[PDB]
Design a protein around this ligand. Structure first.
Ligand SMILES: */C1=C\C(=O)C/C(C)=C\C=C\C(=O)O[C@H]([C@H](O)NC(=O)/C=C\C=C\C)C/C(C)=C/[C@@H]2COC[C@H](C1)O2
Ligand SMILES: Nc1nc2c(ncn2[C@@H]2O[C@H](COP(=O)(O)OP(=O)(O)OP(=O)(O)O)[C@@H](O)[C@H]2O)c(=O)[nH]1
Ligand SMILES: Nc1ncnc2c1ncn2[C@@H]1O[C@H](COP(=O)(O)OP(=O)(O)CP(=O)(O)O)[C@@H](O)[C@H]1O
Ligand SMILES: Nc1nc2c(ncn2[C@@H]2O[C@H](COP(=O)(O)OP(=O)(O)O)[C@@H](O)[C@H]2O)c(=O)[nH]1
Ligand SMILES: [Ca+2]
Ligand SMILES: [Ca+2]
Ligand SMILES: [Ca+2]
Ligand SMILES: [Cl-]
Ligand SMILES: [Mg+2]
Ligand SMILES: [Mg+2]
Ligand SMILES: [Mg+2]
Lengths: 57, 319, 434, 417
């Protein structure tokens, strides 16, 4: 039994039975945002090609 | 319908249990990695016990006790006995043994005491084999082993002056009931014992496959030694089974656990010429003698499986 | 006196936070309007309860807390519920659209846009502290906000409060109550990104809590309200040392010192007893014995088949040291308790003499004595193995991956998170198995 | 994640859509004048998802290339509840021709539809996305509906798009060209929806005829089923609860691969009443509405919704029983892939019901059937003049057939895996 501490609100003790960066975050978030922007631009391009085929028909 | 998976393809015992379960009509075998099983017939190594008992609404049972390896390897049995007070350094039914690494009990391996005392000083080195009366042969050979006192005075069967071991099959269910199958087998040598003829693992001569069953050993004990199998040997066998299994029970019991375990063990015993029984080994994954498969396997199904999963005694209970 | 700031993220974090603060008010005699008649220093002080509560001139005791969620309906319940007057709007942060159970959405897409506001609101709390010790962060593993926003927040807190401790209370996913097939992904992604930033994390598996509610409280179908009442008792036992007078775990650093000797293995198992239905009083020996029963643990796993690195017993109620010591002696001779070779085999014990408080018309009976055991055992790694195997099954077919990639996450973040987890499983194995 | 905007296009789309609004208006206590006259707070808590505001108006846009069906809608039971400006129609019809819907007549009207979609979207606090009801076998719902979806995706690329798509069958058919229009439509859906409920008219027919013993089903009887099922599958969006509570969360739980977003819906009871009975019925192929046998493939994901007062304990039990019983039909590599929700409010006329949404690889059978019916004609170029006279070339047909056969192969791949 070691380190017995007592106060009015309780007590505590130990029983031993046996000894023996902002910038890099910003960069990661922005690279992801850039990838979202790229996939969205690829999609709007594809939709624009559809609009062109529509006009041709 | 109950569901089971099979994760050990080389188990003769569980291949037969598998076959029996399906013929009830009330079990389905699932693919081996499907998690929605009632029963795992598990692999021998790295069975993922930590994945059991987390399936909402499935009572899950496996055919191995986690932690049972302690009993079922050579070095760890020796340690378990020497360090458990209920078994102890001085245990009367387990031959004097030392763990030798190629902590190491080399120094403690008592060899010199016996040499000096003119006593039989033959040992056997093994792991998970050399027999010699010379320490340095055994120590040399080992360079994790155990060195154990070799029983120089075995009981010899007549005719043919020959050594045997006894295999008992024990099933421990989910409630930790311990059942000893009432049929054991003697695995004989069929070479006369000379101090091949020393390891029981002219073949076939005295009995089919060098396997004598209990009916014939009991008859032999009656005719030649005026006693019985029950009195001379099985009292001790039952004592040892129980002592071993009760010792690990707090370490392995699945009583309050989110999954349940059962397991089949093979205990190997030697009998000395005073009719004293000694434990040699516990096998975590035994096979069975050919003629006893069907009876034992049915019994596993009745006692370990249907107990937990009812459908719509070959065993002695050790209390 | 050194303050602690609590941060509650996503549905689970917020709802658990509301249960904890309610219970904290009841333990300290703080009323719903924030008044505390027993506090005789009006307008401030440096009592132990001031670690968790500031004071206004009018005598209102205000949680040192922030609540953040990416949609509004949970935090709106805080704004209108019983304890509404405790909090000021700056403490309560909501977006409009949630992370849809997608770590990538919480971390990258929506996280980017609300993080600065969250850091501002936390800084307003930090600036009223004389000696901020650090943060307690409550969240789910499985939600997109609880997973993805939390990991982003933890990173930015390491940057802005580099010397401060951070503790987690983390809700590990369970299918009987989970709302998403992709929870294993979220759990692994957030555990990988958070691991370097958290000093100590208390995991609660919803499966274990659910089962305790069913078995010991006789609830047929536990709700979040039932789960959260139980969870808040365990949380309260853990934080009691910070909020009452005592000499054990009195600062956040000591949680690490006493429970975490190796930084990556920082996930202690909590076990709590007794849990008794509010429809026969247990001794110290009985409750202490119950701390070694898997059925009382916050994560189902088997401590007999790992090793302990530390063990702390936190008692509340009528308990004296002599009874604790006699019970430890008893249990040592009956149980499989193996410490690693490089740590002492022993217990740190704290006793707070006030019994546990129960919430009026809760499910939990009042008891004379209770205990929470915090053990750092390798057996908790069973829970990492379960999750990792689930992750493997889905990831091998790339199931649901496109949702994450579509929020601008790279696929390699999956395999990197996974690799980190395989090294964690291996760390536990080396410490834990001969 | 509040408002959904609803669009119903062409005859089928508007007939089923009218019934949907009738049924969900009854469940939320909204009368045909838009006044709330119900009993329970559950009814109003999530009303904003489908209705603008003490009058409640459906967030609904009604589209056709001919006036007839919309005139019927306006005269119909709940006809007066729709916003008058939200009826957008031309005069000329689409002649059961996808090219007319998609490229010629539809193109002339689509801008006016988008004007109204935008005015409805612009007064959303936080738009989740769009639900479209239509047939694939005609011209306006099929051709103009998929034209609309493509235009909506261009203007709202980060919003969810959900359809209730009626697939044609020879046995409940108006014209021979239905397979052509469905094939052209399906390649659009594959690309531009996040979730599509596949409703086979033959399945609806056989449920009415074989199971409900209606000796002569009308479209009206088919639609009665459909609207009930739509009511079921939207319960989670419309009432308080935890699971699949918005369109995006539902997609994240139901769609493991982007193109495999075609679901088989089901309803129980369908008998000519206990939790075990509901549960067994909802997993039976006779209760499902895509005419594919789920025993011929594997469930990727399932959502089960129970409605009424019942034991949640017994619901959890039955749901666990079904999965632990037929675990061969659930892919093993998505753990815990069946999710169950329970809403207290039952549908009209029933103490309890269940709705099933399955993402099953068996759906391939529906696409293969369409594919074969397409080929039988297309190998002789039969009936093509109706499409080439609107400007289309045979190559667009070759490409649509290829795209549909690719979808079929992709299902197959996951069925075997
Ligand atoms: C539309 C109903 C209507 O126009 C005709 C009437 C008065 C009733 C139709 C009932 C109906 O379709 O019942 C279906 C089943 O046949 N019912 C059962 O199986 C009942 C009990 C079984 C016990 C074992 C179920 C359906 C499709 C009901 C739907 C619910 O949504 C509203 C719609 C009303 O009926
Ligand atoms: N114990 C408990 N678990 C909860 C609670 N709410 C949610 N969960 C669990 O948390 C997980 C779901 O994450 P949530 O916290 O709801 O999600 P979120 O953080 O709000 O993230 P998004 O909604 O995706 O933005 C599941 O495993 C739930 O069962 C709660 O109040 N208590
Ligand atoms: N201490 C001892 N004294 C005498 N003979 C011994 C002995 N230890 C082993 N033996 C003999 O050696 C045989 C093989 O020994 P051991 O039991 O260690 O090997 P094993 O592991 O192959 C048996 P099993 O197939 O049952 O697992 C024993 O059956 C017995 O015949
Ligand atoms: N279930 C159902 N199918 C319908 C209904 N009206 C038409 N159909 C089907 O819809 C297809 C014809 O398309 P329709 O909607 O009439 O043409 P559109 O007006 O050009 O969109 C065929 O498959 C019909 O069987 C209806 O009210 N209910
Ligand atoms: Ca004060
Ligand atoms: Ca740090
Ligand atoms: Ca014109
Ligand atoms: Cl700092
Ligand atoms: Mg052996
Ligand atoms: Mg949320
Ligand atoms: Mg028509």
């Amino acid at each position: 039994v070691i380190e017995l501490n007592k106060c009015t609100s309780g007590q505590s003790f130990e029983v031993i039975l046996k000894p023996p960066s902002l910038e890099e975050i910003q960069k990661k978030l922005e690279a992801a945002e850039e990838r979202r922007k790229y996939q969205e631009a690829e999609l709007l391009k594809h939709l624009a090609e559809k609009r062109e085929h529509e006009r041709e028909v | 319908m109950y569901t089971f998976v099979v994760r050990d393809e080389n188990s003769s015992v569980y291949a037969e249990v598998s076959r029996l379960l399906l013929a009830t009509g009330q079990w389905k075998r699932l693919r081996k990695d499907n998690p929605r099983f009632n029963l795992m017939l598990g692999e021998r190594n790295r069975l993922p016990f930590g994945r059991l008992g987390h399936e909402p609404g499935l009572v899950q049972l496996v055919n191995y006790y986690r932690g049972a390896d302690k009993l079922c390897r050579k070095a760890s049995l020796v340690k378990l006995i020497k360090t458990s007070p209920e078994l102890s350094e001085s245990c009367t039914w387990f031959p004097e043994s030392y763990v030798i690494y190629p902590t190491d009990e080399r120094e403690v391996f008592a060899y010199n005491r016996r040499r000096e005392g003119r006593e039989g000083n033959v040992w056997i080195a093994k792991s998970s084999i050399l027999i010699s009366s010379e320490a340095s042969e055994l120590l040399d050979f080992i360079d994790v082993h155990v060195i154990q006192k070799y029983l120089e005075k075995p009981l010899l069967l007549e005719p043919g002056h020959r050594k045997f071991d006894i295999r008992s099959w024990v099933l421990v269910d989910h409630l930790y009931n311990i059942y000893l199958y009432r049929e054991g087998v003697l695995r004989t040598s069929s070479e006369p014992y000379n101090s091949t003829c020393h390891l029981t693992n002219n073949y076939g001569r005295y009995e089919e496959g060098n396997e004598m069953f209990f009916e014939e050993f009991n008859q032999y004990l009656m005719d030649a030694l005026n006693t019985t199998l029950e009195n001379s040997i099985l009292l001790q066998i039952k004592h040892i089974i129980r002592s071993c299994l009760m010792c690990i029970e707090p370490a392995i019991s699945t009583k309050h656990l989110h999954y349940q375990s059962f397991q089949l063990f093979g205990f190997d015993f030697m009998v000395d010429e005073e009719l004293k029984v000694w434990l040699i080994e516990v096998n975590g994954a035994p096979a069975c003698a050919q003629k006893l498969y069907a009876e034992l396997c049915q019994g596993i199904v009745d006692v370990a499986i249907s107990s937990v999963f009812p459908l719509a005694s070959i065993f002695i209970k050790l209390h | 006196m050194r303050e602690c700031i609590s941060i509650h993220v996503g549905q689970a974090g917020v709802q658990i936070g509301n249960a904890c603060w309610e219970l904290y008010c009841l333990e300290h005699g703080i009323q719903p309007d924030g008044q505390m008649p027993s506090d005789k220093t009006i307008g401030g002080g440096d009592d132990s309860f001031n670690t968790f509560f500031s004071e206004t001139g009018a005598g209102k005791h205000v949680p040192r807390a922030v609540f953040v969620d990416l949609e509004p309906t949970v935090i709106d319940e805080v704004r209108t519920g019983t304890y509404r007057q405790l909090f000021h709007p700056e403490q309560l942060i909501t977006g409009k659209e949630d992370a849809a159970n997608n770590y990538a959405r919480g971390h990258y897409t929506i996280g980017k846009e609300i993080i600065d506001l969250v850091l501002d609101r936390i800084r307003k709390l930090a600036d009223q502290c004389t000696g901020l010790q650090g943060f307690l962060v409550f969240h789910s593993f499985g939600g997109g906000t609880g997973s993805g926003f939390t990991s982003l927040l933890m990173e930015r807190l390491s940057v802005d409060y580099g010397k401060k401790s951070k503790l987690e209370f983390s809700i590990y996913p369970a299918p009987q109550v989970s709302t998403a097939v992709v929870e294993p992904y979220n759990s692994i992604l957030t555990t990988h990104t958070t691991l370097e930033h958290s000093d100590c994390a208390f995991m609660v598996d919803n499966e274990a809590i659910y089962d305790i509610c069913r078995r010991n409280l006789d609830i047929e179908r536990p709700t979040y309200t039932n789960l959260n009442r139980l969870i808040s008792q365990i949380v309260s036992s853990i934080t009691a040392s910070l909020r009452f007078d005592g000499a054990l775990n009195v600062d956040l650093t000591e949680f690490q010192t006493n429970l975490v000797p190796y930084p990556r293995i920082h996930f202690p198992l909590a076990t709590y007893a007794p849990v008794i239905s509010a429809e026969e009083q247990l001794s110290v020996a009985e409750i202490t014995n119950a701390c070694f029963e898997p059925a009382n643990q916050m994560v189902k796993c088997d401590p007999r088949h790992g090793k302990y690195m530390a063990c702390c017993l936190l008692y509340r109620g009528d308990v004296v040291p002599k009874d604790v010591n006699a019970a430890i002696a008893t249990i040592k001779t009956k149980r499989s308790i193996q410490f690693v070779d490089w740590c002492p085999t022993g217990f740190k014990v704290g006793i707070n003499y006030q019994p546990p408080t129960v919430v009026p018309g809760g499910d939990l009976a009042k008891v004379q004595r209770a205990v929470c055991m915090l053990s750092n055992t390798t057996a908790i790694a069973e829970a990492w193995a379960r999750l990792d195997h689930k992750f493997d099954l889905m990831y091998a077919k790339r199931a649901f991956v496109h949702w994450y990639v579509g929020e601008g996450m790279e696929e390699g973040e999956f395999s990197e998170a996974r690799e980190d987890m395989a090294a964690l499983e291996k760390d536990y194995e080396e410490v834990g198995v001969d | 994640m509040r408002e959904i905007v609803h669009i119903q296009a062409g005859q089928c789309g508007n007939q089923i859509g009218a019934k949907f609004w009738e049924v969900i208006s009854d469940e939320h206590g909204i009368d045909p004048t838009g006044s709330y006259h119900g009993d329970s707070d559950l009814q109003l808590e999530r009303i904003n998802v489908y209705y603008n505001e003490n009058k409640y108006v459906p967030r609904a846009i009604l589209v056709d290339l001919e006036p007839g069906t919309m005139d019927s809608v306006r005269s119909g039971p709940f006809g007066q509840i729709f916003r008058p400006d939200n009826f957008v129609f031309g005069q000329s019809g689409a002649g059961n021709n996808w090219a007319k819907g998609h490229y010629t007549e539809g193109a002339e009207l689509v801008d006016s539809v988008l004007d109204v979609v935008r005015k409805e979207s612009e007064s959303c606090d936080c738009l989740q996305g769009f639900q479209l009801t239509h047939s694939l076998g005609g011209g306006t719902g099929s051709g103009m509906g998929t034209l609309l979806i493509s235009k909506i995706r261009e203007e709202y690329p980060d919003r969810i798009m959900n359809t209730f798509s009626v697939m044609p069958s020879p046995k409940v058919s108006d014209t021979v060209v239905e397979p052509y229009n469905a094939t052209l439509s399906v390649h659009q859906l594959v690309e531009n929806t996040d979730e599509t409920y596949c409703i086979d008219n033959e399945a609806l027919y056989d449920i009415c005829f074989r199971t409900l013993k209606l000796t002569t089903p009308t479209y009206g009887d088919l639609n009665h089923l459909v609207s009930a099922t739509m009511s079921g599958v939207t319960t989670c969006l419309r009432f308080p609860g935890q699971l699949n509570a918005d369109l995006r969360k539902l997609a994240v739980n139901m769609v493991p691969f982007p193109r495999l977003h075609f679901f088989m819906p089901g309803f129980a009871p369908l008998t000519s009443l206990t939790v075990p009975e509901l549960t067994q019925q909802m997993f039976d192929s006779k209760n499902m509405m895509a005419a594919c046998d789920p025993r011929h493939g594997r469930y990727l994901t399932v959502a089960a919704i129970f409605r009424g007062r019942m034991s949640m304990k017994e619901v959890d039990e039955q749901m666990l029983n079904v999965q632990n019983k037929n675990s061969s039909y659930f892919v093993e590599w998505i753990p815990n892939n069946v999710k169950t929700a329970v809403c207290d409010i039952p549908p009209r006329g029933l103490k309890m019901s269940a709705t099933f949404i399955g993402n099953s690889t068996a759906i391939q059978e529906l696409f293969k059937r369409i594919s074969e019916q397409f080929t039988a004609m297309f190998r002789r170029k039969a009936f093509l003049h109706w499409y080439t006279g609107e400007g289309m070339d045979e190559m667009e047909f070759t490409e649509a057939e290829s795209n549909m056969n690719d979808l079929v192969s992709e299902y197959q791949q996951y069925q075997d895996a």
